[PDB]
Amino acid sequence: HGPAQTPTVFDKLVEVTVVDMNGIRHRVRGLQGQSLAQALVEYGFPDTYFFPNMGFYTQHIVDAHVFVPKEFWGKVQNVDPESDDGLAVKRMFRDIVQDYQRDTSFFASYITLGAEHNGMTVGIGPIKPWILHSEWAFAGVHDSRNKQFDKPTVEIW
Amino acid sequence: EAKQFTPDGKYMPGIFSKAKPLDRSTQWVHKNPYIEAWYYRRDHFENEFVWNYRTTIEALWFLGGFTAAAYALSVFAFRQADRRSGYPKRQILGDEPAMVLPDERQFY
Amino acid sequence: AAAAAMIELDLCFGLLLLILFGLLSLRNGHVSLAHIRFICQCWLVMITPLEVQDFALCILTVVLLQSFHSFEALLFLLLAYIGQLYMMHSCNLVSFYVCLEAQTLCVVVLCGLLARGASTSFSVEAALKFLLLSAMVSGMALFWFSAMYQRTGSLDMVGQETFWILLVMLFKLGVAPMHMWSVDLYGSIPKSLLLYLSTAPKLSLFTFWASSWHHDFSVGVFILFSMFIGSIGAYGQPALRSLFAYSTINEIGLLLLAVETAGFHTLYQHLGIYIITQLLLWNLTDKRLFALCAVSLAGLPPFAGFFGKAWIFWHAMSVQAFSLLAAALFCTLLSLVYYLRVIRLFWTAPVHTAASFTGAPNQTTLTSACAVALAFAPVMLVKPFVI
Amino acid sequence: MFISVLLILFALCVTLIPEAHYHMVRVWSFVATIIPMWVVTWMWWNFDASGHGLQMLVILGRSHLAFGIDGVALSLMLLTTVLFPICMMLLRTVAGFMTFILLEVLVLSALCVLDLLGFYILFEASLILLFLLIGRAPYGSLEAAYKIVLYTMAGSLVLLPTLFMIYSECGTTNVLYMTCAYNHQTVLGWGLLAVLAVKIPLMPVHLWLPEAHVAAPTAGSVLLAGVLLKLGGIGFLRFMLPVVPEFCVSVFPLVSTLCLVSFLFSTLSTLRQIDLKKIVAYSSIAHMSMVTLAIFSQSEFSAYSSSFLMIAHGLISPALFLIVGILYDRAHTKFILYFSGLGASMPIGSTLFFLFTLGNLAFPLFPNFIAEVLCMVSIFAVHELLAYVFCVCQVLGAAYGFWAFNRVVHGLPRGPADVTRTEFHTVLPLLIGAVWLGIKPMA
Amino acid sequence: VFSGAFNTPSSTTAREPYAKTKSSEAEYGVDTPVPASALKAADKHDALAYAVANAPLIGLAGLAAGAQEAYMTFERLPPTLSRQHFKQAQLLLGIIGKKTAYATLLGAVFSFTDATVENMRGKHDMTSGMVAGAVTGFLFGMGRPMPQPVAWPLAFAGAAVAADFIGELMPKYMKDYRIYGPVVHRENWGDPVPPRPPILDTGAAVRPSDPGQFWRGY
Amino acid sequence: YKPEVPGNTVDNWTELRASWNKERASSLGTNYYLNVAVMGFAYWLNEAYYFPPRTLYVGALVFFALYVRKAYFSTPYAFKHEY
Ligand SMILES: CCCCCCCCCCCCCCCCCC(=O)O[C@@H](COC(=O)CCCCCCCCCCCCCCC)COP(=O)(O)OCC[N+](C)(C)C
């Protein structure tokens, strides 16, 4: 231990360029170890962009459909397609995305921001109408100014 | 060189103190990664079961073989006990109607 | 002489006065209608006869009306109660058809009316599917009633055509494999109508079955379908609404096992315990009591759900219905896993309960705390009580 | 009965104490388990040994739940009331205190019930408590909790219709009239075998124990090993042998081969274990197999010898779990490869470990020696070879016991320091009980 | 009652068999008649006629599974394939017909092997069901990787064994079971004799195996 | 220690995406066809309750062995342009 640098937030900052569904580019800052869906929520994106992670014991996690370029395909975390997490991802692809799926389609909670994501450009993918319960649904149209960040709780019930 | 007690007793936590306090985790082991991996693998060894040749053969001759040996020995001991007690042939499970439960009012 | 029909005239006069009072109250711009709800509850008490089942339905509907707020919803629930009450007294297929159709129309309209937010179109979609599926079952009932009426020349419910009427009754209880309308309803429609749908019509229809129904057939394959499909579906569906829909299919399979072996006393005991648990389930604000519903719907011993399952098992073993009983025991072993998932979700978690801001502070703690005392009912359940 | 209501209501008052008074919460929860130990000792004082088999009876009308005392229930109740304050000394939260208080109520009422439906209601009402105790979030294992709960539920669900079958057959589930009526013994015998062969770990329905008894905390392991396995033995001795004796004769070759293969295969598995808690956990299966065969022999004084082995196991194996729990609490591992030379660094703990190792291997001056001798007298009187199988395999138990002791106690000194006053007093009542019951057990 | 010396019920037995217990003032059963198709389907003396009587019911299960799979395949068809009605009909009818024929084959093999071993051994016991299950499961398990040519005979034999134990042996063992009236072989206890067995309106899957268990009807 | 996820992330994620690039049908067709099947053909099982138990048990096992699961169901016919 010596005269080495004091830790700053700028050492742990990750910048991601996000293109929303209107084509507008956005600058999104996050921290290392934070997932991508959390940084998207804290940036101030509307609540129609997000949906529950459809696994058991993880519906309190919000998730988004993102398009990831081929260079950053290998930095998405690995999911066993035979495990229960794999069936959760399969349920999300079956029910939420459907025929908006591309070869670049991932889910934003499965991306953990590190230094390798610095400068990565992603885009928000479209989703189909869905319902979890009466207090959390999506009718299909992204016409709402309510941010996801302003919701005090994520309710599974 | 920490000081966790006042001169009249009175334990102090030393939350903001510079010196490292001696506590419950003072003698916790430094984990060897390969030992932790080997114990994890032995903890989940049911994922390594496979119906190959050796598994099938050893499960037949030792597990089923000694189970059949113990069943044969148990039946042998039961029959010999009934013969050395003056009883007739007695009804075990699946053995046609016969005598079960000797009467105390009877001399055998 | 019409002197034996004053309760019917009282029903009609009360409806005529209640509509006019609701009109006068709305001309003043009243944004709350607790006075209308009290008059509705008084009308419910005043039209109900002095039988056990009739008053069980009456007290249940009085408790249910505290979760509904508009005038039209209260009117639809009263006119659904008329069908629910008079189906228990129906001794023909004429009145049976009219009571069932009144209930179906009221449920469809309430599903359309009460939806709000982003879940409005999902509720309307599920109401449309329920209406279309209900129309063809109503057509089957009418067609086979016409067949029976032509064959016998009378209104007796005897002969081979009663098998299709029995299938109509099994549709109305959400019995698998005709179960998916209820599964669709559970995923979108709000919690108050889900509370209404799981309690009152099952009581009404089972009382009609106890009172005036005989068939020469069996329901065993539908018992097997309901128990296995409900248990496996609730094991496999991560959404909680679908979990409770499939667990409801499992419970109606157990009630059908109680019907099939005769012995309606175990049926009535299990149905009452289930209805009280439903009244607790859909009015919960503290999530720790969600674990009490879990241990009392899994049949765990000291709580009242154990007793409700265990007299069904006892009477099934008494008349030696061995295969259906073995299937019921296997599905009971499976049900414990997802009720433990419920306990993992809502008991082993930090407690957060938001306070009220616009008044009405935790407005149904009385009913939920009263229904949690199903841990004290087992002292009366062990005795020869329900017979 | 009035006393039992008062003890329950005093025990349940732990929840109403405000949590900021830490000393009061500790003292209240410890005294709430001390008092039933005094009451059960008084019940032993009140017992007439030349009187009736069932004494101090009470029946609660038409609600089932009838109670009475015999020798087996009284000895097991004394052991449970000893074991529960030691569990209270190993917990730190009000949730733990309340779970163990509810468990003590259920165990004590289940040990002396005389109604089969009452036994069913009282025993497996502890299932959800065991699930929460084993699958606790940061340091438990949900897989183990699922296994123990699902195996117990499977056995209980097999029993429940047969219980109701005899209830419809004669009109009651009271054991005094169930033993005097004519019943279809094959069906009820299979139901009772199904519950009690899961409670007692008998192969093949034994796989829940190695996961659950290791994933549990030290207090949970003390309770599960020393108490809850013996509910299967008291189930055999109180309900199954008196009510279905024809079945109990006809199933003897099958129960006999299950006991023999459980003993041999579980002893063979214990030798390859590399976890100290898993070593202690497997060794209990062979002892319970000897208990079950001694119960089923019915030959000389079979209830006496089998109850005495249940008490000797319930004294010796919780102490081994306590020593492993000390090592885990102050070294954060249960792995044999991390421990060596514990004689030089924990001389008192190693001495206690050696004495309880010798006790677990049924050496003399321990109650296990008297227990195994009398159990083999009961087994020998049916046939000599059924005793010979247990006699010749004594090298296999001593192999794992001395190998585990020699690997962790001798060698290069590394590991934690010696025991504290609190750890010594958790161990100490079991040692005094062992010395008494192994030297002068009777008068 | 409870001593450490011995277990008295283990040696306190009857010295003679008992007489039949009178349970009601009327000792004749009341029940609905069995249809003649099931009466004929119980007969095992003609192995071919037994298989012909039993196999269509086991083929009904394959018909149900095939109809399910056919509808689930039809729903996923794109419009360029779904509008070709002859091809659609032959695909869906192929799926249904293959399932129905495979189920009927497995059922006929099981029933014929069961009645053949029945007539060959000269007696009715559980061996014929186990052999028929082993044959049928080996037919199902052929051509598959290897846990399966052993696992499927075991599953079909286990289904046969469960069928014998639950549906045949346990009702036979409990023919003298009574839930009402005097306790059987304990008539001295004094429980009163009703005028009749209890009338229960049970379903067709719950029928009295003895005339004295209950009266079934309405 | 934590176990490694088996496989490659790109290959696993392509396996997760497979057969779901299609609009899901509404459930009204499945529900209507189920109700039609029960209301038209469930009377065929009326005499089956009296059949021997070996036949009923083997038929139940046969229905379980030939059952196709509705969840995660996919056909190759969904993505081909000719039969
Ligand atoms: C089935 C018989 C019961 C035997 C079970 C084995 C008991 C284990 C220890 C053996 C001690 C023998 C004691 C003999 C004299 C004591 C009184 C007595 O007679 O025993 C009682 C019961 O005895 C007991 O309850 C003994 C209690 C033993 C439990 C000891 C373990 C708990 C102590 C833990 C350590 C505490 C240390 C604390 C100090 C710091 C009744 O048994 P029987 O004589 O068979 O009954 C007669 C039958 N009939 C009425 C029908 C004529």
Side-chain angles (χ1 to χ4, degrees):
Chain A
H1 206 264
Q5 41 180 345
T6 186
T8 58
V9 178
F10 297 110
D11 294 332
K12 300 272 162 179
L13 269 182
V14 181
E15 208 192 301
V16 179
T17 304
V18 179
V19 192
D20 63 345
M21 301 152 80
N22 286 341
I24 301 301
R25 275 172 191 266
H26 293 276
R27 172 177 301 171
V28 166
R29 291 270 176 88
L31 283 163
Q32 290 181 11
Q34 184 179 22
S35 75
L36 189 72
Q38 271 311 113
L40 290 184
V41 163
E42 276 169 49
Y43 173 75
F45 274 131
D47 50 355
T48 51
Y49 286 9
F50 304 97
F51 46 84
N53 197 284
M54 289 311 293
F56 302 89
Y57 318 107
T58 177
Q59 282 170 42
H60 65 284
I61 304 286
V62 285
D63 218 341
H65 178 205
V66 297
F67 292 138
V68 176
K70 189 177 184 184
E71 172 189 347
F72 303 95
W73 278 359
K75 303 153 179 62
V76 182
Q77 68 181 357
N78 205 3
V79 174
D80 185 22
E82 317 278 348
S83 67
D84 280 331
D85 299 348
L87 301 176
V89 183
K90 279 185 192 172
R91 281 192 304 277
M92 274 179 320
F93 271 128
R94 178 190 72 222
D95 294 299
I96 300 162
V97 185
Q98 307 189 18
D99 51 353
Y100 296 125
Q101 184 204 124
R102 301 175 171 184
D103 53 339
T104 54
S105 278
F106 293 92
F107 290 116
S109 73
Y110 298 89
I111 296 152
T112 298
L113 287 175
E116 63 263 12
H117 296 87
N118 205 0
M120 164 191 68
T121 300
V122 302
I124 298 291
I127 56 182
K128 298 281 300 186
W130 58 267
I131 176 155
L132 186 69
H133 40 85
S134 276
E135 316 293 332
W136 199 9
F138 176 47
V141 179
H142 296 259
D143 276 23
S144 81
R145 283 160 179 169
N146 299 338
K147 308 176 174 211
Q148 180 62 230
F149 185 69
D150 279 324
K151 292 179 176 210
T153 50
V154 179
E155 295 154 352
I156 318 168
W157 181 251
Chain B
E1 282 182 349
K3 294 176 183 179
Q4 290 161 283
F5 286 101
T6 74
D8 49 357
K10 296 185 182 180
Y11 168 71
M12 299 189 284
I15 294 151
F16 314 119
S17 178
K18 175 178 69 181
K20 186 173 67 171
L22 308 175
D23 62 337
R24 159 180 156 253
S25 78
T26 305
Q27 297 191 279
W28 284 4
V29 296
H30 300 292
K31 292 181 173 184
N32 192 292
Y34 309 100
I35 293 178
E36 297 299 314
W38 176 53
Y39 272 94
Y40 182 88
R41 179 200 182 184
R42 291 287 290 269
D43 206 355
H44 292 79
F45 200 77
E46 77 265 25
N47 307 322
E48 303 199 15
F49 181 81
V50 57
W51 287 111
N52 49 34
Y53 183 68
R54 184 193 180 110
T55 286
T56 310
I57 290 314
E58 296 191 307
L60 259 66
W61 83 257
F62 185 53
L63 290 192
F66 273 62
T67 316
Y71 183 71
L73 167 70
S74 304
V75 175
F76 174 73
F78 185 84
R79 297 290 183 216
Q80 287 298 289
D82 286 355
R83 209 206 79 244
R84 289 157 83 187
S85 165
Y87 296 152
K89 286 290 289 289
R90 285 216 282 182
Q91 172 182 18
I92 67 173
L93 287 178
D95 198 74
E96 287 288 327
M99 202 264 278
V100 185
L101 289 194
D103 198 8
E104 193 50 49
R105 308 162 296 178
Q106 183 61 259
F107 292 84
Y108 296 97
Chain C
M6 290 312 180
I7 184 166
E8 274 78 36
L9 200 56
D10 198 78
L11 188 148
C12 299
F13 284 170
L15 285 161
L16 287 176
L17 293 179
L18 171 65
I19 288 155
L20 260 52
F21 194 59
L23 169 62
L24 292 173
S25 179
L26 287 175
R27 295 289 293 160
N28 285 76
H30 295 153
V31 306
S32 295
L33 300 179
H35 49 286
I36 313 290
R37 192 210 328 272
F38 176 71
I39 281 160
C40 285
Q41 288 156 339
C42 277
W43 180 87
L44 287 182
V45 165
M46 279 302 167
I47 67 164
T48 307
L50 284 158
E51 206 55 48
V52 186
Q53 294 112 319
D54 285 335
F55 264 121
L57 184 67
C58 177
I59 295 310
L60 172 64
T61 52
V62 170
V63 171
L64 292 180
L65 281 193
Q66 296 282 152
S67 65
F68 295 94
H69 304 294
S70 66
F71 177 75
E72 291 95 35
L74 291 173
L75 198 59
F76 302 144
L77 288 154
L78 294 200
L79 300 157
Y81 176 83
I82 287 174
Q84 282 179 352
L85 188 152
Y86 274 83
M87 194 165 65
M88 319 158 78
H89 301 263
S90 73
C91 56
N92 292 131
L93 287 179
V94 177
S95 44
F96 175 80
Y97 167 74
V98 181
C99 291
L100 269 190
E101 283 315 290
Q103 290 168 240
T104 297
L105 196 60
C106 280
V107 161
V108 165
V109 163
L110 282 158
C111 285
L113 163 74
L114 299 177
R116 89 162 76 186
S119 76
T120 304
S121 57
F122 297 93
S123 181
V124 173
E125 186 191 302
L128 277 168
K129 300 194 224 176
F130 169 64
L131 185 57
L132 293 169
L133 293 161
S134 290
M136 63 87 71
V137 174
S138 171
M140 289 275 177
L142 286 174
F143 186 73
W144 288 107
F145 174 38
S146 73
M148 216 188 312
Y149 178 46
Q150 200 176 73
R151 187 183 52 81
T152 77
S154 60
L155 285 177
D156 272 0
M157 311 187 264
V158 289
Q160 185 85 18
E161 298 93 339
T162 61
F163 176 75
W164 280 274
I165 309 299
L166 162 73
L167 294 172
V168 176
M169 292 166 82
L170 297 185
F171 175 78
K172 300 296 185 162
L173 303 163
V175 172
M178 318 190 260
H179 63 282
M180 281 304 300
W181 63 268
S182 186
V183 191
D184 282 330
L185 289 190
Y186 268 59
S188 55
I189 294 89
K191 290 202 308 174
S192 80
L193 286 173
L194 284 193
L195 170 64
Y196 167 72
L197 271 165
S198 44
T199 56
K202 300 198 219 308
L203 178 57
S204 189
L205 194 59
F206 273 133
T207 44
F208 163 74
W209 202 325
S211 161
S212 193
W213 184 249
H214 168 79
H215 64 94
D216 268 22
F217 306 97
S218 174
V219 290
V221 68
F222 297 107
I223 291 166
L224 290 185
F225 265 116
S226 283
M227 291 190 314
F228 278 117
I229 277 174
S231 279
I232 286 154
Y235 177 72
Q237 292 269 4
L240 292 182
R241 297 277 198 105
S242 46
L243 188 147
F244 282 113
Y246 282 112
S247 79
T248 305
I249 302 154
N250 188 22
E251 294 318 303
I252 207 75
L254 281 174
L255 295 176
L256 276 191
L257 173 61
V259 161
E260 162 82 357
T261 67
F264 272 53
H265 61 296
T266 74
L267 173 78
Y268 275 125
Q269 189 178 316
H270 190 231
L271 181 53
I273 294 154
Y274 182 74
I275 282 169
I276 287 175
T277 313
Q278 290 318 286
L279 274 162
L280 169 58
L281 178 67
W282 301 110
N283 292 309
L284 269 179
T285 50
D286 197 307
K287 305 294 171 61
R288 293 180 284 212
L289 306 174
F290 208 77
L292 179 89
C293 316
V295 305
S296 182
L297 278 169
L300 284 186
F303 307 96
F306 163 74
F307 299 97
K309 272 176 175 170
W311 286 269
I312 288 179
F313 289 163
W314 177 35
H315 188 79
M317 194 67 166
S318 291
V319 296
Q320 305 185 237
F322 294 131
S323 292
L324 304 175
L325 186 47
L329 293 161
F330 267 98
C331 292
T332 301
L333 176 65
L334 185 48
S335 312
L336 178 72
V337 184
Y338 54 77
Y339 285 129
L340 284 172
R341 165 159 83 236
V342 172
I343 279 156
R344 275 180 58 190
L345 274 174
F346 284 109
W347 179 264
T348 45
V351 169
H352 174 78
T353 309
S356 80
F357 319 118
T358 177
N362 217 353
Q363 77 197 352
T364 312
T365 44
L366 183 64
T367 306
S368 68
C370 174
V372 160
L374 61 83
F376 287 83
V379 176
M380 280 312 164
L381 293 175
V382 286
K383 326 286 203 277
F385 194 84
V386 185
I387 187 167
Chain D
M1 161 66 47
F2 188 71
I3 296 173
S4 77
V5 172
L6 282 184
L7 267 61
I8 285 154
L9 275 168
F10 175 76
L12 286 196
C13 282
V14 176
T15 47
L16 311 175
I17 308 177
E19 298 257 25
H21 306 135
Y22 308 107
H23 172 96
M24 177 166 168
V25 163
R26 300 298 311 218
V27 166
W28 201 295
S29 54
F30 191 66
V31 162
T33 71
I34 280 179
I35 295 157
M37 183 166 73
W38 284 352
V39 179
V40 172
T41 307
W42 179 84
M43 288 177 77
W44 190 12
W45 169 264
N46 211 38
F47 193 77
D48 184 17
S50 293
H52 198 47
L54 279 174
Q55 281 164 44
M56 293 177 259
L57 313 165
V58 58
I59 183 176
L60 282 72
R62 52 195 82 157
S63 83
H64 315 279
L65 291 195
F67 303 91
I69 308 300
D70 74 320
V72 193
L74 189 61
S75 51
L76 281 188
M77 279 159 67
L78 202 66
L79 175 64
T80 57
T81 57
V82 173
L83 282 182
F84 264 102
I86 304 177
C87 295
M88 275 306 167
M89 289 173 77
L90 303 151
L91 297 161
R92 84 196 285 277
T93 51
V94 164
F97 305 147
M98 288 300 304
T99 50
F100 272 74
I101 279 168
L102 292 164
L103 277 154
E104 178 158 37
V105 167
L106 289 171
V107 171
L108 279 185
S109 51
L111 275 173
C112 76
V113 66
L114 286 167
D115 200 285
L116 184 50
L117 181 49
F119 188 75
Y120 191 87
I121 287 163
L122 287 174
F123 177 76
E124 65 153 5
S126 64
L127 197 66
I128 180 59
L129 300 165
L130 289 177
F131 173 76
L132 294 165
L133 171 61
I134 290 163
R136 62 211 199 280
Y139 287 117
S141 166
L142 280 166
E143 302 95 309
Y146 271 126
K147 271 189 187 174
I148 177 178
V149 159
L150 277 156
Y151 270 88
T152 313
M153 193 79 188
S156 313
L157 280 180
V158 179
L159 169 66
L160 193 55
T162 70
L163 192 151
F164 280 125
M165 178 219 80
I166 188 170
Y167 180 45
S168 292
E169 184 148 18
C170 79
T172 186
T173 54
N174 196 79
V175 75
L176 294 177
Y177 288 91
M178 277 196 312
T179 187
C180 293
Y182 159 70
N183 69 82
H184 290 271
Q185 298 195 15
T186 316
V187 184
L188 181 68
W190 269 115
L192 291 158
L193 195 47
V195 291
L196 306 165
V198 180
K199 304 209 208 298
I200 289 174
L202 267 188
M203 294 186 183
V205 292
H206 78 294
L207 278 299
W208 60 269
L209 187 143
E211 265 86 8
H213 285 209
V214 172
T218 305
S221 294
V222 169
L223 175 59
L224 280 157
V227 168
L228 289 192
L229 309 167
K230 282 96 196 187
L231 269 296
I234 206 170
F236 286 144
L237 285 164
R238 187 161 279 224
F239 286 102
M240 201 178 71
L241 280 187
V243 175
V244 288
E246 312 173 334
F247 183 82
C248 285
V249 164
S250 286
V251 67
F252 179 75
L254 174 64
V255 169
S256 198
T257 181
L258 282 189
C259 288
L260 290 172
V261 303
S262 298
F263 165 75
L264 183 72
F265 291 167
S266 67
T267 316
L268 283 181
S269 292
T270 314
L271 199 47
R272 310 299 309 254
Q273 296 303 299
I274 53 174
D275 201 301
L276 274 165
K277 207 170 181 191
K278 278 173 184 162
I279 283 172
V280 177
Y282 288 185
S283 57
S284 168
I285 297 166
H287 295 304
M288 290 322 288
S289 64
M290 184 182 262
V291 160
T292 310
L293 195 42
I295 285 166
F296 264 78
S297 75
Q298 316 194 45
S299 82
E300 282 283 322
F301 264 72
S302 82
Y304 204 109
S305 43
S306 69
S307 316
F308 188 78
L309 189 41
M310 288 198 265
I311 292 294
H313 184 258
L315 282 186
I316 293 297
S317 64
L320 291 173
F321 272 132
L322 280 173
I323 296 169
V324 169
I326 287 154
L327 276 182
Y328 173 64
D329 183 68
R330 282 204 277 111
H332 201 70
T333 187
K334 301 176 288 206
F335 296 165
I336 285 179
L337 291 196
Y338 284 123
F339 291 113
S340 166
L342 279 172
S345 81
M346 319 176 64
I348 295 167
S350 308
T351 298
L352 291 157
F353 192 34
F354 183 57
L355 293 182
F356 284 112
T357 291
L358 283 180
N360 190 53
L361 298 179
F363 276 71
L365 311 181
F366 296 93
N368 293 112
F369 177 76
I370 292 163
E372 64 88 19
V373 161
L374 296 172
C375 279
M376 289 191 322
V377 170
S378 306
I379 285 154
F380 188 93
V382 180
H383 206 275
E384 305 98 296
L385 296 177
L386 302 177
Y388 180 76
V389 172
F390 286 98
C391 280
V392 71
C393 286
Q394 282 176 6
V395 57
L396 298 173
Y400 69 75
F402 274 84
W403 198 24
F405 180 79
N406 282 311
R407 271 182 298 182
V408 308
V409 165
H410 306 123
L412 188 152
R414 54 163 78 98
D418 213 357
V419 295
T420 65
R421 200 172 285 264
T422 317
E423 293 158 7
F424 192 84
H425 282 75
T426 53
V427 174
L428 200 56
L430 310 180
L431 178 60
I432 297 169
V435 165
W436 161 52
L437 289 175
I439 293 180
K440 292 287 283 198
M442 57 192 50
Chain E
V1 172
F2 283 122
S3 73
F6 44 83
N7 191 73
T8 43
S10 309
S11 72
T12 304
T13 73
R15 65 154 182 276
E16 294 166 2
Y18 283 97
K20 187 166 165 64
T21 293
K22 183 176 181 179
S23 291
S24 47
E25 289 303 310
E27 303 264 24
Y28 53 94
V30 175
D31 208 347
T32 61
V34 188
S37 184
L39 280 189
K40 200 170 174 67
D43 209 339
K44 256 192 193 191
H45 84 279
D46 202 337
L48 204 64
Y50 181 76
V52 168
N54 271 295
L57 182 79
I58 305 181
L60 203 43
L63 175 58
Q68 174 187 359
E69 183 182 359
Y71 187 72
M72 293 205 314
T73 313
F74 158 73
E75 267 203 353
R76 312 297 181 98
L77 282 183
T80 175
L81 270 69
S82 70
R83 78 182 87 169
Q84 309 175 41
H85 298 131
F86 183 81
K87 300 289 284 193
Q88 167 195 173
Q90 78 171 358
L91 175 66
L92 301 192
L93 282 182
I95 289 173
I96 285 175
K98 284 171 186 179
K99 282 273 166 87
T100 306
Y102 198 40
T104 313
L105 165 73
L106 290 164
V109 160
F110 186 82
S111 307
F112 193 72
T113 305
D114 192 24
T116 299
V117 177
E118 178 66 26
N119 289 337
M120 189 162 294
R121 292 181 93 241
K123 64 174 78 72
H124 172 53
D125 70 313
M126 301 201 324
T127 300
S128 57
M130 295 166 96
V131 169
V135 167
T136 309
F138 186 73
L139 180 54
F140 186 86
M142 267 196 300
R144 307 183 177 277
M146 191 75 204
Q148 304 196 53
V150 168
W152 289 108
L154 271 188
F156 270 85
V161 161
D164 280 335
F165 270 125
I166 292 162
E168 166 170 332
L169 283 178
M170 200 185 303
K172 173 164 69 73
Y173 172 64
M174 307 183 39
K175 275 189 190 302
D176 58 316
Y177 193 72
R178 293 298 188 275
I179 59 155
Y180 69 103
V183 177
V184 181
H185 312 331
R186 295 297 183 268
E187 295 102 310
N188 61 296
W189 287 6
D191 301 298
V193 169
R196 63 169 170 265
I199 299 164
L200 293 166
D201 193 6
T202 67
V206 184
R207 282 188 316 124
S209 278
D210 186 74
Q213 282 176 354
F214 60 95
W215 278 8
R216 173 178 185 275
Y218 69 108
Chain F
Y1 186 79
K2 292 177 180 179
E4 283 273 90
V5 185
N8 195 15
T9 175
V10 179
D11 299 328
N12 286 327
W13 272 90
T14 50
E15 180 47 58
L16 293 171
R17 278 190 222 92
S19 79
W20 310 123
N21 196 3
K22 191 176 68 180
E23 174 183 64
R24 303 277 301 184
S26 161
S27 73
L28 171 62
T30 308
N31 306 333
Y32 208 101
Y33 270 82
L34 264 166
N35 275 108
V36 161
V38 170
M39 290 280 167
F41 306 104
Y43 81 105
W44 286 355
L45 284 181
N46 280 343
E47 288 176 343
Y49 293 97
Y50 306 87
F51 290 167
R54 260 168 187 180
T55 307
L56 302 173
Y57 271 69
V58 174
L61 184 60
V62 158
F63 181 78
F64 187 42
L66 303 188
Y67 179 82
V68 287
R69 302 186 177 187
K70 184 180 177 296
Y72 318 107
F73 175 76
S74 64
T75 44
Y77 280 91
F79 297 110
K80 72 202 305 175
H81 49 269
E82 55 92 19
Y83 285 91

